Each structure stands twice: as C-alpha cells, then as structure tokens.
Structure 1
Amino acid sequence: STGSATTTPIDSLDDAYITPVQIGTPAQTLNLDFDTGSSDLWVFSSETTASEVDGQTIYTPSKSTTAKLLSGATWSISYGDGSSSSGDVYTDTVSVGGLTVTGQAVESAKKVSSSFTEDSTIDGLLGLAFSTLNTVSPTQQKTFFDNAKASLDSPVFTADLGYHAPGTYNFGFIDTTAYTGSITYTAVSTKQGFWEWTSTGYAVGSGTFKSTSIDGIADTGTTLLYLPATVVSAYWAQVSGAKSSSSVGGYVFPCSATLPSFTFGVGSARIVIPGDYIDFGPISTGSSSCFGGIQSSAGIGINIFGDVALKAAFVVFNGATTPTLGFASK
C-alpha cells in the first residue's frame, strides 16, 4: 500500500505545517502537525478541558463506531519548546492520504498547554520519530508509520515541505518526479529515538564550504534550523546589523537586509537553503527588526534540522531494518 497527503503551512511564515488525517468511523478529519521529532499521535478531543479549546477541531471517540478505550493507558508529553499535553488513549482507524491503519493508538488530550490552545490551526500531532519515544504508559504504543510499515510497498515515508506553499507527505514510495538530481543517503542513529544523522559541513552564501561533522536531527515539527553557536555566528556575521538579542531570544536582523543562503552537507552532496527561507519577519507587528531562521542550539543539547532546512530538500525517511535518511535538491 501507499498514502499521499498534502501538507499546508499554517501561516504566512511557515511556522508549522498541517496535514489532514481521518480518524474513526465515520471519518473525523483533523489537521495534524506531522512531527518527525516525536512519537505520539495526540488530538484535541471531546475530553479536552473546555477552557483549553479555542477553535480546534476535536475528535469525539463516542461518535466513532471503531473507537475503543485502551484501558488504563495514559500519556504525557513535553516538547523542546516548553509546550505540553496529556490524557488517555483510544485505539481507532486512522488514515492518511489513502493509507489506513486499524488499531492505531489515538491519544486523547485532557489537558494542553497554552501554546496549543492559542494555535487554532493545529488539531494535534502525528509523531513520526521512533516508537521508543512514545509516552503511553504502562504499554508503549507504536507510531502510525511503525504500524503501517509492513503493509507499505517500501518501508519509507518522504517529506517534501514547501516554502510559503503546500507540499507533500508520501508513505510507501519515492516520487521520482519530486526532486532533481539524485538522492544522497546518510547513516542514522536511533539511539535517542530520533532521525539523527551527521551533516558533513556548511557554507554561508557564496563562501567556501567548511568540512565539519554536525550531528543533529531531522525534525519536521521544529520550525527553525538550530546549529552550533560557531556556525550560527559565522552566518549572521554576513548580515549587516544582525545581532543576538537576549531579550528577543535569538538572532535578529534589520528587515531591510538581503539574507545570504546557507548550504549544508549531506555526504558529498550539498543542500542550499535560499536566504529568503531564513526570514521569519518582524519580531512584533510593525517592527523593523526581523527574526532569524537560523539560531543557536547551545542549551538545547542537540542540533535540529527543522523546517527551514528540510523545506529546501526532498527528504526520505527510510525505515528499513537499518534506517537511513536521504536528501535531494528539488
């Protein structure tokens, strides 16, 4: 089998992407944030504290003839950005882009943190990291991909995120029309539960390529590109007036600037992030200070190839017995 679904930016900055997902019988369609950096499929629901729901579409398990309470199971998650959610668990039928999994763990939120409430466009998350990170207790549950994998034509999914435009998540096949040149594959460590890999270096604008190993994760659920402070300083040094602002929480730059591109290495291959992808707009409405899309990972504890990086590529998440990651230009 295969599946193919369009993923759409939630706003004009590409702060996140939402993908429609069918849950239950009859289908209840919720727009979920596909997150290769976590491993829980959780939704706003009829069980979510009413004051914490503000415009989201909710899953109502009592209206699904295929929903079953997973007795005794609870979940609780905290994300790197400080947001969190928790609740109980149902199993139900879940379909993405025509690909159906029966008995998928659908984690129903009883509580969500303010950042979730405040984002009306995101009805939940669909985790696509390794199932070892799934938070369900006392019986850990599998991701949608893990459940689908054996049925797929090939045990892969691909992320093709758009810049200020929709893109595509495919399951079970590689669309050879969706990228240019060849796909370069690179090794993955699953030891921390992430799609963790090592970039071979970087360049800033038309500058020379610096060969250096940068371990990090391919994370569709993180907006920005978080890299070591040395790398980030070298980038922003090429933007007149750019500075790290402790009060704002990262590098800012004059909105009148033209940003240079940023290149990262995948083996001997190179992915170029155009400068415009690195602009996250005014820090507050009407400001002439703009927020940068490349930020330091210092104090996160890990480098993160988030959407800023991934949207410059066609990315293969290869879930073969030994997983790997593939990147192509597009």
Structure 2
Amino acid sequence: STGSATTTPIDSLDDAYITPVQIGTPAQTLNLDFDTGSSDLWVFSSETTASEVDGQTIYTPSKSTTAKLLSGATWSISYGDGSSSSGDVYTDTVSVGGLTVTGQAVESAKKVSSSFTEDSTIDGLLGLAFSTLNTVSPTQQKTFFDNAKASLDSPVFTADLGYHAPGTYNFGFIDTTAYTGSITYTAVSTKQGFWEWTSTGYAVGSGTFKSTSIDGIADTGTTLLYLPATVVSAYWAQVSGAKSSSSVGGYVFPCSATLPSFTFGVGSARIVIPGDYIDFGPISTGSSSCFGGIQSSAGIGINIFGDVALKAAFVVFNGATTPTLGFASK
C-alpha cells in the first residue's frame, strides 16, 4: 500500500504545516502537525477542557463506531518549546492520504497548554519519530508509520515541505519526479528515539564550505534551524546589523536586509537553503527588526534540522531494519 497527502503551511511564515487525517467511522477529518521529532498521535477532542479549545476541530470518539477506549491508558507529553498536553487513549481507524491503519492509538487530550489553545489551525500532532518515545502508559503504543510499515510497498515516508506553499507527505514510495539529481543517504542513530544524523558541514552564502561534523535531528515539527553557536555566529556575521537579542530570544536582523543562503552537507552532497527561507518577519507587528530562521542550539542540548532546513530538500525517512535518511535537492 501507499498514501499521499498534501501538507499546508498554517500561516504566511511557514510556522508549521498541517496535513488532513481521517479518524474514525464515519471519518472525522482533523488537521494534524506531522512531527518527526515526537511519537504520539494526539488530538483535540470532546474530552478536552472546554476553556482550552478555541477554534480547533475535535475528535469525538463516541461518534465513531470503530473507536474503543484503551482501558487504563494515559499519556502526557512536553515538547522542546515548553508546550504540553495529556489525556487518555482510544484505538480507532486512521487514514492519511489513502493509507489506512486499523487499531491506531489516538491519544485524546483532556488538557493542552496555552500555545496549543492559541493556535486554532492545529488540531493535534501525528508523531513520526521512533515508537520508543511514545508516552502512553502503562503500555507504550506504536506510531502511525510503525503500524503501517509492514503493509507499505517500501518501508519509507518522505517529507517535501514547501516554502510559502503546500507540499507533500508520501508513505510507502519515493516519487522520483519530486526532486532533482540524486538522493544522498546518510546514517541514522535511533538511540535517542529521533531521526538523528550527522551533517558533514556548512557554508554561508557564496563562502567556502567548512567540513565539520554536526550531529542533529531531522524534525518536521520544529520551525527553525538550530545549530551550534559558532555556526550561527558565522552566518549572522554576514548580515549587516544582525545581533543576538537576549530580550527577543535569538538573532534578529534589520528587515531591510538581503539574507545570504546557508548550505549544509549530506555526505558529499550539499543542500542550499535560500536566504529568503531564513526570514521570519517582524519580531512584533510593525517592527523593522526581523526574527532569524537560524538560531543557536546552545542550551537545547541537541541540534535541530527543522523546517527551515528540511523544506529546502526532498527528505526520505527510511524505516528499513537499519534506518537511514535521504536528502535530495528539488
């Protein structure tokens, strides 16, 4: 089997991407944030504290003839950005772009933190990291991909995120028309539960490539590119007037600037992030100070190849017995 679904930016900045997901019978379609940095499929629901729902579409398990309470199961998650959610668990039928999994754990939120409530466009998350990170207790549950894998034509999914435009998540096949050149594959460590890999280096603008190993995670659920402070300083040093602002919480730059590109290495291959992808607009409405899309990972504890990086590539998440990651230009 295969599936193919369009993923759409939530706003004009590409702060996140939403993908429609069918849950239950008859289908209830929710727009979920596909997150290769976590492993829970959780949704706003009829059980969510009413004051914490503001415009989201909810899953109502009582209206699904295929929903079954997973007795005794609870979940609770906290994300790298400080947000969180928790609740109980149903199993139900879940379909993404024509690919159907029966008996998928659908984690129903009883509580969500403010940042989720405040984002009306995201109805929940669909985790695509390794199932070892799944938070369901006392019986850990499998991700949608893990459940689908054996049925797929090939045990892979691909992320093709757009810049200021829709893109695609495919399951079970590589669309060879979706990228240019060849796909370069690179080793993955699953020891922390992430799609963790090592970039071979970077360049700033038309500058020379610096060969250096940069361990990090491919994370569709993180907006920005978080890299070591040395690398980030080298980038922003090429932007007149850019500075790290402790009050804002990162590098800012004059909105009048033209940003240089940023290149990262995948083996001997190179992925070029155009400068415009690195502009996240005014820090507050009407400001002429703009927020940068490349930020320091210092104090996160890990480097994160988030959407800023991934959207410059066609990315293969290869879930073979020994997983790997592939990157192609597009």
- Aligned partner of 1:320 in structure 2 is 320
Q: Distance in 2 between matches of 1:329 and 1:306?
A: 16
What's the offset of the Cα at 1:180?
0.1
What's the offset of the Cα at 1:199?
0.0
Q: Distance in 2 between matches of 1:251 and 1:50?
A: 37
For residues 155-189 of structure 1, the C-alpha deviation after alignment (integer angstroms, 9 at most, x for no partner) is: 00000000000000000000000000000000000
For residues 24-60 of structure 1, the C-alpha deviation after alignment (integer angstroms, 9 at most, x for no partner) is: 0000000000000000000000000000000000000
What's the offset of the Cα at 1:117?
0.0
SS in 1 for 2:30: strand
Q: Distance in 1 between matches of 2:255 and 2:125?
A: 32
What's the offset of the Cα at 1:271?
0.0
SS in 1 for 2:173: coil
**Unaligned regions of 5+ residues in structure 2, if any?**
none
SS in 2 for 1:159: strand
Q: Distance in 2 between matches of 1:154 and 1:173?
A: 6
For residues 94-130 of structure 1, the C-alpha deviation after alignment (integer angstroms, 9 at most, x for no partner) is: 0000000000000000000000000000000000000
Identity of aligned residues (%): 100
What's the offset of the Cα at 1:247?
0.1
SS in 1 for 2:76: strand
For residues 173-224 of structure 1, the C-alpha deviation after alignment (integer angstroms, 9 at most, x for no partner) is: 0000000000000000000000000000000000000000000000000000
- Aligned partner of 1:137 in structure 2 is 137
What's the offset of the Cα at 1:11?
0.0
> Over the residues paired in the alignment, what is the CA RMSD in angstroms?
0.0
SS in 2 for 1:95: strand
TM-score (norm 1): 1.00
What's the offset of the Cα at 1:149?
0.0
SS in 1 for 2:150: helix
For residues 78-105 of structure 1, the C-alpha deviation after alignment (integer angstroms, 9 at most, x for no partner) is: 0000000000000000000000000000
Q: Distance in 1 between matches of 2:230 and 2:245?
A: 16
Q: Distance in 1 between matches of 2:301 and 2:52?
A: 30
- Aligned partner of 1:247 in structure 2 is 247
**Unaligned regions of 5+ residues in structure 1, if any?**
none
Q: Distance in 1 between matches of 2:45 and 2:282?
A: 34
* 1:192-211 equivalent positions in 2, closer than 5 A: 192-211=192-211
For residues 224-280 of structure 1, the C-alpha deviation after alignment (integer angstroms, 9 at most, x for no partner) is: 000000000000000000000000000000000000000000000000000000000
For residues 270-296 of structure 1, the C-alpha deviation after alignment (integer angstroms, 9 at most, x for no partner) is: 000000000000000000000000000
- Aligned partner of 2:173 in structure 1 is 173
- Aligned partner of 2:231 in structure 1 is 231
SS in 2 for 1:149: helix
After TM superposition, where is structure 1 displaced by more than 2 Å over at least 4 residues in a row?
Answer: none
SS in 2 for 1:136: coil
Q: Distance in 1 between matches of 2:272 and 2:239?
A: 17
TM-score (norm 2): 1.00
Q: Distance in 1 between matches of 2:66 and 2:299?
A: 44
SS in 1 for 2:221: coil
Q: Distance in 2 between matches of 1:113 and 1:248?
A: 22
